[PDB]
Specification:
Elements (H helix, E strand, L loop, with lengths): L1 E5 L11 H6 L1 H14 L3 H7 L1 H4 L2 H21 L6 E4 L3 H8 L5 H18 L6 E6 L3 H11 L5 E8 L2 E6 L1 H14 L3 E4 L12 H12 L24 H8 L4 E2 H10 L4 E5 L4 H9 L4 E5 L2 H8 L3
Parallel strand pairs: 1-2, 1-8, 4-7, 8-9
Antiparallel strand pairs: 3-5, 3-6, 4-5
Helix pairs in contact: 2-5, 2-7, 5-6, 5-7, 7-10, 8-9, 10-11
Enzyme class: transferase
GO biological process, one term: fatty acid biosynthetic process
Catalytic activity: holo-[ACP] + malonyl-CoA = malonyl-[ACP] + CoA
Length: 305
Amino acid sequence: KTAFLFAGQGAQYLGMGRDFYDQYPIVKETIDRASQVLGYDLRYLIDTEEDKLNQTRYTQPAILATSVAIYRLLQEKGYQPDMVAGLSLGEYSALVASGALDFEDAVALVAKRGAYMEEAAPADSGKMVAVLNTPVEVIEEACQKASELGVVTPANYNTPAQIVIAGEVVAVDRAVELLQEAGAKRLIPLKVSGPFHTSLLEPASQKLAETLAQVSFSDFTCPLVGNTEAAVMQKEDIAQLLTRQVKEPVRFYESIGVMQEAGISNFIEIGPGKVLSGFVKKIDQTAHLAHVEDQASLVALLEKL
């Protein structure tokens, strides 16, 4: 019946979760637990350090702790998910919600993940273009022809009409030239992060694989649809899949199709932000959808209960 969709990097904002934090002990406990694991006050970072909040190595545990706290709050109000998924970093939040990853383990692990991603691909390096309203085949082909010139592949399959390509500057420029020729009307350059979810991140993925080998995963208490394979993840595959996730495409709409086939009717995006909700509305405007990131959005959800 219901899937929780967890936020990814880029949706953070100063003060996120603070309303919940003061009001709900399950929230304060979750954030202060992450603060202990980290060796610094995450609540103060989120509330006051805007530049650090936007630095990958802090963004990742900030969002994960905030999201896990929001999911845990939803659990206290009587919402339990039947399936989960999360956007990139949000996959780890979903791993925590799905019972497979310990919360304190997650917090340390994403601080490391963030670090490795940031060093291997800084926020201003390479290029990312959102290619709107063009067939997937065209985008893939364009990126293929352009690959002779360097790394360029689709990074984020968001909707059938919204695919972000990423990689190195010259190679990505050659890709959009091929797209315009092919007739692509709407190509939006993005200044969000390094070219994540391409082979450029292979060095990152090596370090993460060593770190992951140390992480001990548990049984899934609920099914999780993974970013990489757009399929329900199996316990024995988690680390191999998280290893590839940082250097391979995130396949969001295909994942939403697996959940609709599993018969899920209702979607709740766990904040910060409403990015996944925007995507699922395009995938299927008839799908029942809600997001929770703050007191107002919590009430809008609960008043249907």
